[PDB]
Symmetry: D2
Subunit: 122 residues, 4 copies
């Protein structure tokens, strides 16, 4: 909720800096430790601003297009996942990284993986 805003780090050492707005907006920057990336990229996404009463995770997702002032990878990643708060707060995601490709190469356009974000660098 409010618990989402701030800096998060994944298992690769990437840095996810986000603000969760009152009704569901996510805005911030992403800096990847790997791949065809340097410095920060804009991200935007959405989260459930009124998660379930049973303490289920807070669903959210966000997108990075891998273009910034320094570099353009011609690709975009979406992370889809859920935030869980508490002493071991986490954002558990799966992601789809699509590169722009010709139609013939479209079958190999999309990588899939999973990132776990924590409040401390692993």
């Amino acid at each position: 909720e409010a618990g989402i805003t701030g800096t998060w780090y994944n298992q690769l050492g990437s840095t996810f800096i986000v603000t969760a707005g009152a009704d569901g907006a996510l805005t911030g920057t992403y800096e990847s430790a790997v791949g065809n990336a340097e410095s920060r990229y804009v991200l935007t996404g959405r989260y459930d601003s009124a998660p379930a009463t049973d303490g289920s995770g807070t669903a959210l997702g966000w997108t990075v297009a891998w273009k910034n002032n320094y570099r353009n990878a011609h690709s975009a990643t979406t992370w889809s996942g859920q935030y869980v708060g508490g002493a071991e707060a986490r954002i558990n995601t799966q992601w789809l990284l699509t590169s722009g490709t010709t139609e013939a190469n479209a079958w190999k356009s999309t990588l899939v993986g999973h990132d776990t974000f924590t409040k401390v660098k692993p």
Copy 2:
């Protein structure tokens, strides 16, 4: 943009989007299926300087399935590419994550693929 406009997928969902000069996607999504009614806000990003060698334009966007009427406690992200020209298409794969208790997290996420066209 190119990307800007009203799109429909194979399910009959409606994707109304505007592509900004800064790489932003903004608009609304209305799903023909699932735990959804009416329009939901979406935001996303696209490559605003794509390759000129015939490649598609990479993009993605998110919907959290809460609006003024309903809350599914879930979010879909679509990742894909825009292919322009006479019969422009957006081809995607998506991940739908539901918020879940710890016991149910293994089954939190559905995966699929949606193809969008501007044909009503």
Copy 3:
């Protein structure tokens, strides 16, 4: 059993899937890809629901190819997970995961994801 599975199938990429469905759930056959790091036929094995529902629902199944044969070794494996539907427009509708062997540093980009639809003609 689901006798409708056994035979030759073709996907939208021009690949050929030749399979035998055993009475109690075995899939065995060969796969020839029209794309990627692949030449000639590769062994496949998998499983299917040999007593599917009779309400018109599909028959769940999946199979694996490791991309090594007598000609070539791509150091990768693909699994297709999907469902068979019979009738006049019989199809096997799948999603797949193609994992390459990688070093630990490159494991984040080990897996491609996509979808293939197999039909009895094309």
Copy 4:
């Protein structure tokens, strides 16, 4: 032939018992700790029987159809991933669980997740 051969457990406590044959076969049983499943199910799959020698993992995949003598969930899972040997040996996977569905429900036929296996008995 085999590092891969053995009894493995994932983060859910599920048990994967596998034999890796000299030419690329995987056979064994799977018991899920979760879902519409009880006791053991047959699996088959394939792995790269001549992996790279540069420190890369060994690609593999396998399928379970969730029908056995006790229960039938009309579903199948495939795991695609790689085996990383040494200490601590691990098989890192992503999986697709497809249920047989009507055409109207096919959009929600397939779950996706990731399982990591080790030889450590919970």
